[PDB]
Amino acid sequence: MNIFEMLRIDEGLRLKIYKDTEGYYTIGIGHLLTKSPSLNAAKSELDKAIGRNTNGVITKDEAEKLFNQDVDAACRGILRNAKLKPVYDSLDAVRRAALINMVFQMGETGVAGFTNSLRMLQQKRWDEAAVNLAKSRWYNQTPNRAKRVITTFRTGTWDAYKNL
Ligand SMILES: *SCC1=CC(C)(C)N(O)C1(C)C
Numbered sequence: 001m002n003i004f005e006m007l008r009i010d011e012g013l014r015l016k017i018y019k020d021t022e023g024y025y026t027i028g029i030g031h032l033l034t035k036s037p038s039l040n041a042a043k044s045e046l047d048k049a050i051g052r053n054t055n056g057v058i059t060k061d062e063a064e065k066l067f068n069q070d071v072d073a074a075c076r077g078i079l080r081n082a083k084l085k086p087v088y089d090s091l092d093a094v095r096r097a098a099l100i101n102m103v104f105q106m107g108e109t110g111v112a113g114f115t116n117s118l119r120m121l122q123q124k125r126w127d128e129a130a131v132n133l134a135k136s137r138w139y140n141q142t143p144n145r146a147k148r149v150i151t152t153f154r155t156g157t158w159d160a161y162k163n164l
Pocket residue numbers: 071072074075076100
């Protein structure tokens with residue numbers, strides 16, 4: 001298991017633009033299109049991202065390039081963020097994917113706002129980190145997905161993703 005298959009389980013694959021759990025237009029493997037409530041804005045952003053007249057539908061191949069682009073962006077965002085990099089530096093490979101999962105979902109700025117949870121993780125206080133992570137908007141908006149990521153942080157294993 002790796003960050004790519006982890007996120008594929010968490011995000012799924014949908015070929016036509018859909019509304020995420022927060023009401024924002026998204027497509028592919030968790031690719032946020034826009035925060036605007038206009039569907040045409042989403043199709044225009046989708047057109048801009050794919051470079052063709054999409055009409056709200058993307059191929060499976062285009063979704064995987066968007067996926068690779070977004071994973072690359074999430075990694076670069078972590079490495080260039082002054083508060084995310086030292087925590088990422090200290091984590092093992094399994095927990096590094098969990099942090100990238102967070103940034104992939106809610107962006108670099110949002111994850112950096114977990115001031116208490118990030119200090120927990122860097123000090124390898126997993127149990128306490130899990131408790132603090134569950135007390136967030138993230139946890140009650142996407143509980144099933146957040147529980148899997150939090151379990152990954154707590155145990156350092158892929159057990160939350162076994163048989164999924
Ligand atoms: S930080 C994410 C990352 C790690 C590594 C395996 C070196 N990569 O190819 C990327 C940049 C995706």
